[PDB]
Amino acid sequence: MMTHEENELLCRVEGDAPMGRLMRRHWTPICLVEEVGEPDGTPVKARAFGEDLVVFRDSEGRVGVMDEYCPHRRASLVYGRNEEGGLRCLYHGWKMDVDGNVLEMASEPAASGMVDKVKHTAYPTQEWAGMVWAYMGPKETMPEFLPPAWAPTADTRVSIAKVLLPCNWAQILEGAIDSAHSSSLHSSDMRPSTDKAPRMQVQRTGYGFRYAALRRPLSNAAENDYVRSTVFVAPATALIPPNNLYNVANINVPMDDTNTAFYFIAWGHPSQTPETETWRKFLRQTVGVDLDQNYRPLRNEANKFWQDRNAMKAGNFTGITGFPNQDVAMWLTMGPIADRTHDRLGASDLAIVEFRKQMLDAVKAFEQGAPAIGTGVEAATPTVCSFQAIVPKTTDWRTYDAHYVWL
Amino acid sequence: MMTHEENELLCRVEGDAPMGRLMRRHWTPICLVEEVGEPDGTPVKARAFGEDLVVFRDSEGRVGVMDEYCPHRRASLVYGRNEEGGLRCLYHGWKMDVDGNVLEMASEPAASGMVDKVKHTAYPTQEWAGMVWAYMGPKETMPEFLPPAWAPTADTRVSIAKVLLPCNWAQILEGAIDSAHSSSLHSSDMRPSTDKAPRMQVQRTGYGFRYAALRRPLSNAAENDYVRSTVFVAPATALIPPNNLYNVANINVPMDDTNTAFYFIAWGHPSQTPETETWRKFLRQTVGVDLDQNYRPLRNEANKFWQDRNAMKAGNFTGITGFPNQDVAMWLTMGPIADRTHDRLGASDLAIVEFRKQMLDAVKAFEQGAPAIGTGVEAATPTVCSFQAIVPKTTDWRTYDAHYVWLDG
Amino acid sequence: MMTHEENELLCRVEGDAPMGRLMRRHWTPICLVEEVGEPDGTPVKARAFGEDLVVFRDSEGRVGVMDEYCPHRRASLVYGRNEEGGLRCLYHGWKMDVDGNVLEMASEPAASGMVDKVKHTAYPTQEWAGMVWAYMGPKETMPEFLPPAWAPTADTRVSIAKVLLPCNWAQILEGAIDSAHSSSLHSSDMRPSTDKAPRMQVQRTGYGFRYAALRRPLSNAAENDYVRSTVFVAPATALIPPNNLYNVANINVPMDDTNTAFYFIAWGHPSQTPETETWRKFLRQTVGVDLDQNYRPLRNEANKFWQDRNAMKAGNFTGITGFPNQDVAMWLTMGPIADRTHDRLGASDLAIVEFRKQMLDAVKAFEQGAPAIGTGVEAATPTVCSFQAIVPKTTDWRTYDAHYVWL
Amino acid sequence: MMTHEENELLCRVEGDAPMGRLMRRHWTPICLVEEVGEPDGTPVKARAFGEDLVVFRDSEGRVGVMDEYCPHRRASLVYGRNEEGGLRCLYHGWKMDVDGNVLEMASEPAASGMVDKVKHTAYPTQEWAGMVWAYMGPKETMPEFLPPAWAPTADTRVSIAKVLLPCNWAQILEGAIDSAHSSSLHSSDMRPSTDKAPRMQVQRTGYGFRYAALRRPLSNAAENDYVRSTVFVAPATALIPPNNLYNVANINVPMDDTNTAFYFIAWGHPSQTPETETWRKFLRQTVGVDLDQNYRPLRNEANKFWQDRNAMKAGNFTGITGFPNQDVAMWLTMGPIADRTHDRLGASDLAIVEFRKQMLDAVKAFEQGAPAIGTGVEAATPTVCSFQAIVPKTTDWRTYDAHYVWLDGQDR
Ligand code: FES
Ligand code: FES
Ligand code: FES
Ligand code: FES
Ligand SMILES: [Fe+2]
Ligand SMILES: [Fe+2]
Ligand SMILES: [Fe+2]
Ligand SMILES: [Fe+2]
């Protein structure tokens, strides 16, 4: 049984919070590449770990991620002019480059003490797989940026739905490591199985854990299992089981203690992996249709996530369209921070139990001096993958030589 | 560098707050005269210093400013019947006059002495320069109402834009004593200088301070300065440099700790000064177009103050229309109470630093029992004015004998 | 100069108007396959040549295209129940199959054999390339359905934007055979040339014509021509010059005399050709963003097609987003039926002149009993293709051996 | 098969049109009582047979129905002041009484000979059964006003849904003389029968016709019939079969050739008949929810009458809420004026066939000088009533001694 205090430790990320300090030891997505446009594009507002950030791509094509508020008198830089190699605040014309250097102050003299040497909070960035990433941890702790398990290479197609969700990251992450839920919630959105009650096994690792959900297959149940294996990559990534054509990953980024940037990714061979808008349409996460311009969902508690009771009477399980929308209805109705003090977990919760244990330990150990889970030598790499396959009851799923879906 | 505690002391006005108590030693604008209409007109809701007020113009034409909540069981009087010399609560028919006497209790037997016992809290009021004013301090401290420096007399055209802004008053006031910002923020809304970096000087006074921004003028920069002088009139009024035709003033009234009634005033000779709707259209502060019926801006953070990025690519500096809306975008994005603990000020902030020093000092002194800054003998006058002028480098600006713009210059 | 009577002959299609009789000798797109759904799906409203149609996919997966009004008392069958092998009107329960046989009249005695005697107007249909096609000509004139030039085969990716436009088809058609327009209208959306004034050459065929716009190339304009060839496929199809990756076609179907279903198609090899939603987003034709649910544009004359004057001052040519929406602005402002009586045509209009001449000749010939242009032996095939290429000055562009783009 | 010319003759009512003339020989509902308010109430805009009307209740409680446009320069009197025994035009202050007499002209010299010489077109009116009625025919043809069949007495509860529909009156009327439609269209809205194909029989009368829909009952089907008898009262009223508690009638007033005021009425003993808002909610014809403030439906073609495809997949027949909205979807999708030249009518259409033949004869006869159908000693009275009952096959339904539903199971 978790305690109130453990819940807080697990979930809070703003400012002081140990869990944030840990998370900030990993490279984090801040926003989509598509949001920042061309050189001199419109500046973008973002939010990670309780901090408001401005993101902008300068004349040379470099992407900056900085504190949103001007270093001078803290007007929002989102309104500023992005040109001639920096972002210029509207108010008194201080201009910053993408590394946070103040290149100029319109109403100030000279250069030696205030003009150049003043440095606006700004983080290292990278662009990869359709996202802008930043390292928001102590600077001297920044590792080399390496390909995530779900975007191994410059030629993988990566297609992203982003949805800003008004609840804490941990209940969303839990929903990616919860194989049984597909067999209820997603049962109108379907495998060689109808088994609703899979056996769970978890293998902890240095970066998180891998787990397998074992279902009785429709044929030769005596002989084999339907294995679906998911990878938990700490702090807040799941590699969930692929389909026959492409892979699927979830990364979640805490905007603050009660909001999360949810990224749902189709990835694989370009000829077998949907493009962005196809993927969004399939998921019902189309900007302008399912989401507003800020990728916030139009489905909400007051319209019951557009649930359709007549669809449900007709045999549609949830009456909610777009399987992630079905997920969201469940997560948001748990409240801004799910109260895990009131859970009644079961066999199906095994990987969620492992998540809670592992992450609580990892944050206490980190606070006492260990490496942040999944950093340095520990890291997951693209050798890590989820998969699904009919497997011999006498083969160890943990040693099964599965690779990501390609060609 | 201010502490959190100094920032609280400067900014908070509600209830006890020292700065509220200081500010209430001065007559305060409550709402526009336009809002109260005619005798027996619709009652108006206002808020000052964290109090909800009802304002109304009775059958004899007198304006009352009173606590909004009925003294019986505290239903809002804003819904009541304004007629026959009083405001009558709908609920049980208690009727108050402009001075908060209860004239009548519809359901109370004249038997009891109740009707003459209850007095509703109501403030002394004045109407002047198109505003309803009230005196919200301890009554025995009420001074004679004298004209503001920006409304000298009955023959002055005074044209007002009112905007209710969801931030704290002090960040708004600071935006009025901040000469350098025009040269960036308002650069597409232009004077005989292209100088963006004015050198600043202040002269402290009994009622606040005057400051001058000096810029190199376009011609004869060798021997002359372009002097723009702004007057800070404590607690929260800036006489901003005039143009060639008319004067510009700003008075800010805290509605509470995180909201302010902003009044942006064109005043001068009628023949040279725009009318109200012309001024509002010029500033894009038109009720029904830029503002709702309560004078709240339709521009906001969610719509990004209607900033148009294509206009900015085309060369417009802020892509925001109406110069005060460009100011508002900056003030509001600093958050409901700007955190000055995080400022990094520079040369261009000298008046703002002065303001913080003087007001923190004035509030401390006032708590210790000194008179509230700018009251009694020390009060600003119509002779105090902002000014703009090409001035010889050998003339001390503090010495320039300026008058407020009138006719012919 | 065209006369009023020639303008009407060319443009009108309702009733027995000869041009509509001519067009109905060709298999015609009625709606997209994506509107009709699964077996027993929601019936769809369509309109072609002045007739309101209902389209539905029955329980066996067959598509019907039928007069919209019930043959009983003419209630709309769009509201009917699509199930159990047919479409049943709500009012008295008459049930039709996709061939317009009445299977049952809920309320009629079976004895007075009326159920066998009543047939409902229903048209032969075909599904191909993501569209539902019908043959709306006299029944015995129905030709074998062959693949159109832009959808050669079952392994071609065809991605379709559909827009319902409130003007007559012919002006929309003309817009696809008007090469010089790209060099103005679409100048901010572009090429091997900045020649704004192409010289024009046309070659008539039995199914339409091909033309070439010849531009001065970026140099070697002494040696070469930059050739873009478009193919007019009568009556209302334009195969437009490819890009280096995929092919583009336009087929327009008159809904009536003043409205047109506009189909703008990307087609080619699946790995080089965008998916539907990608195509629609590129063109700003996304349902729910640019279009309402009936595929009508939200851009219109009262909102000036969302023309942004600020973008124009910043150097964007039109201030209108999505190049087809730029064309649409121009077409709809010419009025419901463009008044060709008041054109002042120039050299750039040669292909438009050919079209006017050929279609007026075609329909005049057809009234006197000539086979409809482009039917039978003369019909365009996938060997007929548009192209674009530098063409050393000394070659007949007419002899150029282009194929569509594939890999 | 009707001709185009016969369709036009049956349906058009504006101005000269003979059907318009025929219909105007009957007292006509113009609006609901509840629209006219109290004395000095807000003037009401109404429209019958192609004329725009203003309706107001004056200071003394009387109701006027008059040409909407001021007799002076034709400004709308709907905007005028209703006070001091009259309606005064805002423009130049001409003031008219409910009889159309000009009481005053604000700007005309007191003894300008013009005052008591201008008469504005104003019709005789009657208030009854929660409606304002007017006599819009030639004044010397006006008959005494008698109770409608469906509102026999001052003690009767009458509850009305009014809906302004954008189609011609005749296709709406036909919808009420079409027993078979209920067994399909209204099959999710349901009786001692599941028979979908009633046998039909008609009995012509001097005011219209009665018809009987005969279905096999669910018990003793070989001996007994379930009889639903509807009465058509010309020109545009149907007394529809009652239920066990109360009575149901439809009166339709053409607003012009392509718009119709539809009144749908529950009536009977006050303790057995729902109140107005009850009835409206049940039918989904509530103002502010189903209808705008002018009683126009928010359900339309563009939103497919809010047809819910999922409800249909779950087994609801039409996916449209409130049985009249189901009717309306069918009527309006036939077009502003249904084209009867393209019908293919079967046995179920017998009452509609009869209505078409009867009303085309009546308007032909009338145009040539016969009395208007259903005027005079010929008038339907409250003795005429629809009914529903199980009846032995050996009994003639024409003979069944029906009375309108009243109390318990006893007559009135
Ligand atoms: S607040 Fe940004 S430059 Fe002054
Ligand atoms: S609350 Fe105001 S009179 Fe009672
Ligand atoms: S109108 Fe369709 S079955 Fe009667
Ligand atoms: S128009 Fe009515 S009084 Fe003149
Ligand atoms: Fe899920
Ligand atoms: Fe400003
Ligand atoms: Fe074009
Ligand atoms: Fe019905």
Short mmCIF file of C-alpha atoms in Angstrom, two decimals, chain B residues 300-409:
data_model
loop_
_atom_site.label_atom_id
_atom_site.label_comp_id
_atom_site.label_asym_id
_atom_site.label_seq_id
_atom_site.Cartn_x
_atom_site.Cartn_y
_atom_site.Cartn_z
CA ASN B 300 -5.41 38.25 -23.56
CA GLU B 301 -2.69 35.60 -23.15
CA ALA B 302 -4.80 32.85 -24.68
CA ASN B 303 -5.22 34.86 -27.93
CA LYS B 304 -1.74 36.38 -27.52
CA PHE B 305 -3.15 39.90 -27.42
CA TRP B 306 -4.11 39.28 -31.10
CA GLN B 307 -0.42 39.53 -32.03
CA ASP B 308 -0.13 39.12 -35.80
CA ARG B 309 3.16 37.50 -36.78
CA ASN B 310 2.70 38.35 -40.44
CA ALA B 311 2.48 42.02 -39.51
CA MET B 312 5.77 41.55 -37.60
CA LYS B 313 7.38 39.91 -40.59
CA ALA B 314 6.11 42.86 -42.67
CA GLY B 315 8.00 45.27 -40.42
CA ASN B 316 5.53 46.17 -37.66
CA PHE B 317 7.46 45.98 -34.39
CA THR B 318 5.01 44.23 -32.05
CA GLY B 319 2.28 43.03 -34.41
CA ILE B 320 -0.08 44.30 -31.66
CA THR B 321 -2.55 47.15 -32.37
CA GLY B 322 -3.03 50.12 -30.03
CA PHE B 323 0.08 51.31 -28.13
CA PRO B 324 -1.48 50.62 -24.64
CA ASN B 325 -2.21 47.07 -25.81
CA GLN B 326 1.50 46.65 -26.51
CA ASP B 327 2.17 47.84 -22.91
CA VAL B 328 -0.55 45.53 -21.59
CA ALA B 329 0.96 42.44 -23.29
CA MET B 330 4.23 43.14 -21.50
CA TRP B 331 2.70 43.91 -18.14
CA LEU B 332 0.38 40.95 -17.95
CA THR B 333 2.93 38.32 -19.03
CA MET B 334 5.06 39.32 -15.97
CA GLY B 335 2.32 37.57 -14.04
CA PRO B 336 -0.36 38.97 -11.65
CA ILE B 337 2.26 40.42 -9.30
CA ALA B 338 5.56 41.02 -11.13
CA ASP B 339 8.35 39.32 -9.17
CA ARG B 340 10.89 42.21 -8.78
CA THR B 341 13.11 39.81 -6.82
CA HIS B 342 14.03 38.54 -10.29
CA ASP B 343 14.55 41.80 -12.19
CA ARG B 344 17.90 42.60 -13.78
CA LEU B 345 17.60 46.41 -13.98
CA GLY B 346 19.95 48.79 -15.84
CA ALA B 347 20.52 52.46 -16.70
CA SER B 348 17.14 52.79 -18.38
CA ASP B 349 15.42 51.67 -15.14
CA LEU B 350 16.50 54.69 -13.04
CA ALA B 351 12.97 56.14 -12.56
CA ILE B 352 11.55 52.72 -11.77
CA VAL B 353 14.32 52.28 -9.13
CA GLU B 354 13.45 55.72 -7.76
CA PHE B 355 9.79 54.78 -7.59
CA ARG B 356 10.56 51.58 -5.69
CA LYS B 357 12.86 53.42 -3.23
CA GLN B 358 10.47 56.29 -2.61
CA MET B 359 7.35 54.16 -2.22
CA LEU B 360 8.94 51.52 -0.01
CA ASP B 361 10.34 54.39 2.06
CA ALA B 362 6.98 56.26 2.09
CA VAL B 363 5.07 53.22 3.21
CA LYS B 364 7.54 52.42 6.00
CA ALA B 365 7.48 56.03 7.21
CA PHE B 366 3.67 56.02 7.06
CA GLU B 367 3.41 52.90 9.14
CA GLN B 368 5.71 54.70 11.67
CA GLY B 369 3.20 57.57 11.84
CA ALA B 370 4.49 60.05 9.22
CA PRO B 371 1.84 61.65 6.93
CA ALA B 372 1.08 59.72 3.72
CA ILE B 373 3.36 60.90 0.86
CA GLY B 374 1.88 63.71 -1.28
CA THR B 375 -0.79 64.73 1.26
CA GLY B 376 -1.45 68.11 2.91
CA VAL B 377 1.06 70.88 2.17
CA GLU B 378 3.14 68.68 -0.22
CA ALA B 379 0.36 67.91 -2.74
CA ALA B 380 1.08 68.13 -6.50
CA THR B 381 -0.67 71.00 -8.25
CA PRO B 382 -1.71 72.08 -11.77
CA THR B 383 1.70 73.92 -11.82
CA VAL B 384 3.41 70.49 -11.76
CA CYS B 385 3.49 69.27 -15.38
CA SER B 386 5.34 66.86 -17.68
CA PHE B 387 6.93 68.43 -20.72
CA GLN B 388 8.91 67.67 -23.84
CA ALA B 389 11.40 70.14 -25.37
CA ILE B 390 14.66 70.62 -27.19
CA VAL B 391 16.79 72.07 -24.36
CA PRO B 392 20.38 73.52 -24.47
CA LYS B 393 23.04 71.27 -22.87
CA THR B 394 23.86 74.27 -20.65
CA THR B 395 20.29 74.54 -19.26
CA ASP B 396 19.52 72.31 -16.26
CA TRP B 397 16.24 70.54 -17.20
CA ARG B 398 15.14 70.86 -13.53
CA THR B 399 15.21 74.61 -14.24
CA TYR B 400 13.07 74.63 -17.46
CA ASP B 401 9.88 76.61 -16.72
CA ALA B 402 7.31 74.22 -18.30
CA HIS B 403 3.54 74.63 -18.44
CA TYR B 404 0.97 72.04 -19.54
CA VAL B 405 0.05 72.19 -23.25
CA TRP B 406 -2.87 74.54 -23.97
CA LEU B 407 -3.35 76.64 -27.14
CA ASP B 408 -0.83 77.65 -29.81
CA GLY B 409 2.17 76.43 -27.76
#
